[PDB]
């Protein structure tokens, strides 16, 4: 019912956006908690969260299908 996907990107350190953490239900809520604790942007994107969850594992860099949408997610998150 509830998904959260945590992406990490730092220029010159992560070659691509990295899914560092994922969570469903209780752990999804925890992540969206902890993201508010540390002031990390949370964006609701149902199709992107669901496809990332189904395709990209924890600890895995995003694949080619996700480059454009995650680029846009990150730009939107940047400011905010």
């Amino acid at each position: 019912a509830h998904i959260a996907i945590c992406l990490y990107y730092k220029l010159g350190e992560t070659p691509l956006p990295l899914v560092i953490e994922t969570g469903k239900d209780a752990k999804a809520l925890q992540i969206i908690k902890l993201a508010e604790l540390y002031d990390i942007p949370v964006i609701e994107d149902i199709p992107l969260a669901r496809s990332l969850y189904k395709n990209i594992h924890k600890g895995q860099y995003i694949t080619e299908d996700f480059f454009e949408p995650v680029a846009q997610l990150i730009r939107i998150a940047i400011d905010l």
């Binding site: 509830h2 998904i3 959260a4 996907i5 945590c6 992406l7 990490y8 990107y9 730092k10 992560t14 070659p15 691509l16 956006p17 990295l18 560092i20 953490e21 752990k27 999804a28 925890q30 992540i31 969206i32 902890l34 993201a35 604790l37 540390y38 990390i40 942007p41 949370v42 964006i43 609701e44 994107d45 149902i46 992107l48 969260a49 669901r50 990332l52 594992h57 600890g59 895995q60 860099y61 694949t63 997610l73 990150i74 939107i76 998150a77």
Partner: peptide, 24 residues
């Protein structure tokens, strides 16, 4: 070919360095 950076720390710390969280 799949690409991983599989070792990492705690749930709290991973989030604190995170860039964006996407949810449904």
């Amino acid at each position: 070919r799949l690409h991983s950076e599989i070792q990492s720390g705690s749930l709290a710390n991973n989030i604190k360095k995170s860039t964006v969280i996407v949810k449904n």
